[PDB]
Amino acid sequence: AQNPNCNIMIFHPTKEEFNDFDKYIAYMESQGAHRAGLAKIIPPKEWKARETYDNISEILIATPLQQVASGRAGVFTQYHKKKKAMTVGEYRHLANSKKYQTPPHQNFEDLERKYWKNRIYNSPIYGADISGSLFDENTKQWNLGHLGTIQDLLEKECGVVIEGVNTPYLYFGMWKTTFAWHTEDMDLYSINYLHLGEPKTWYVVPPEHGQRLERLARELFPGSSRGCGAFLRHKVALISPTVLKENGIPFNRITQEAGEFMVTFPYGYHAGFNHGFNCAEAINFATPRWIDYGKMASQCSCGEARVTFSMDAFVRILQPERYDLWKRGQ
């Protein structure tokens, strides 16, 4: 067995190896990368996503979300309060203001300490889930807007044609903006490129130990658990590394910097936070190995989870028994 300790692996493809996405994901898995639930990929030194980021200020953040915390420093939920629209230019200026700017700190470790100690006492604003892309159309390799669709993967593997399209999203972040503990919709893979700005710290639980985290979550968030049998899909719960360690949950951490890709693997629970103003782009994807995870993925049927048009068909084909009750909830 490759990577038995489930360590987060970091890859440095050559430009030749960077020319076939599916092949390289398969290679990473041949080295056991998926066992961690998350891998970093540093692109070839000659590669770039686009020429410059000089003309991105006019992008609109239609619904910025203020992330309000409730609970204890190391165990809390967050809810998203909708705010008025603003451009990326206005958002960047807000992120850099005295109220929201990254505080003085010695290094990544000091900032992480400050995050977990102080996160709940501030409500940062996140420009999340914005449909669009910052990859240049002429960028041929690892262009997140030119990946094969999950619908085409499902068709190629199962022989059924289905409706739906698969497009990327942009995430404009600031200090303390937070992504809660979750796996992807249908336990798909995700790929995340940090286009610009300050880093993004990630925490991840190995897929083979995902149920340990779920068990702990049920204990730490008893109300949320009773209301929905798959409440982590609401993407509201945070649990600090100190609390994970106290409860024996196996996990790893890694910081992603601008110009680097992260891939999350099927049923790899992850969470994290932004260090300061940044912009990331992400999309879900699938491989042949995902299919069996899709068939087993838990569903939120209480209506709280954000349901996309594309998800209907994946539940319909892969989880026909769940389809009726799931459709009632959403």
Ligand SMILES: Cc1csc(CNc2cnccc2C(=O)O)c1
């Ligand atoms: C509405 C909303 C708030 S946080 C979120 C999901 N974000 C992520 C999910 N998986 C990985 C990384 C991120 C991220 O933020 O980089 C959606």
Ligand SMILES: [Co+2]
């Ligand atoms: Co994710």
Ligand SMILES: [Zn+2]
């Ligand atoms: Zn639910």
